[PDB]
Chains A and B, each alone.
With several copies, the nearest count.
Chain A
Amino acid sequence: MIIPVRCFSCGKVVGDKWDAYLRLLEEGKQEGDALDELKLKRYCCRRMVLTHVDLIEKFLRYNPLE
């Protein structure tokens, strides 16, 4: 829905690295390299960023009820 605060498996904080990851993809880096630059070395942390799906951008398009 929105990027999780912590890696489920080990607990390292990953909720502050989502913006940095999208910017690196505009500069043409490959996904593996982008994760490497952010120092996410264990593959438990890597799944969190690599496989998250950002649905909150879709839900905001619905005009506020109030």
Chain B
Amino acid sequence: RHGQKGTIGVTYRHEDMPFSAEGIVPDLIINPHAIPSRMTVAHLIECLLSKVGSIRGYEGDATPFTDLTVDAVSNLLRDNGYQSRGFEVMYNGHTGKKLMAQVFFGPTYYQRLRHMVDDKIHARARGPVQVLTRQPVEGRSRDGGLRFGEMERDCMIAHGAAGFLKERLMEASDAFRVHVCGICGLMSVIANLKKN
């Protein structure tokens, strides 16, 4: 609940996770680099407070602008047999060897947001076209194609990939054959191909 959002990068089965001496393994793991530049110190304090809260059996009051201090919560926690700042010794799951560093560990409220990958994944080979432009349709729900916009165009010029850019915008899209008159230059030719 602190603007610390992420996607799952991999899953690990129970026995490969790091574990504390009590055999508790974390359910979800986040990265230490998310904290110092974002300065969501409240996220850490919530973890600390919730640890205390689950040991003694109540929901801590985390209302803003109260007399609750970090030291008061830390005092309670140490009196229950855990390190005062929330750390715990943990063991690497692959080898059983201790980690040289201790790991901040505890409950945190996490929320499941509406953006799931199988609602976004999309691919198109060939497919339906617009009646008017004979170009690929717009949108996931219509088997559409991605937009090669103006800024994409510029990048291929910078690479000097002139051949690639031609193919993308013709053979891989709405290529059409027309006949012109060599004298007047208009597309006014009437071409019956079976009568030649």
Contact = CB atoms under 8 A, between A and B. Distances in A.
The answer to whether A and B touch in the complex, with CB atoms under 8 Å apart, is yes
B27 A43 contact: no
Contacts of B59: 51
Interface majority SS (helix, strand, loop, mixed), chain A: helix
Contacts of B107: 43, 47
Interface string A1-23: 00000001111000000000000
Measured as residues with beta carbon below 8 angstroms from the partner, the interface class of chain B is 10 to 19
Nearest to B107: A47
Contacts of A31: 57-58
B99 interface: no
Nearest to B106: A43
Interface residues of A, number: 17
A42 B57 contact: no
Interface in B58-85: 58-59
Contacts of A50: 54, 57
Contact of A32 (B14, B23, B27, B56): B56
Contact of B57 (A8, A10, A35): A35
B55 A9 contact: no
A27 to B, nearest CB: 15
A43 B24 contact: yes
Contacts of A35: 57
Contacts of A44: 24
Interface string A28-63: 001111110000001110110011000000000000
B150 interface: no
Contacts of A32: 55-58
Interface of A: 8-11, 30-35, 42-44, 46-47, 50-51
16 contacts: A9-B27, A10-B24, A10-B25, A11-B14, A30-B57, A31-B57, A31-B58, A32-B56, A42-B23, A42-B24, A43-B51, A46-B57, A47-B107, A50-B54, A50-B57, A51-B59
Given A43-B54, A51-B59, 11 more contacts: A9-B25, A9-B26, A10-B24, A30-B57, A31-B57, A32-B58, A44-B24, A46-B55, A46-B57, A47-B54, A47-B107
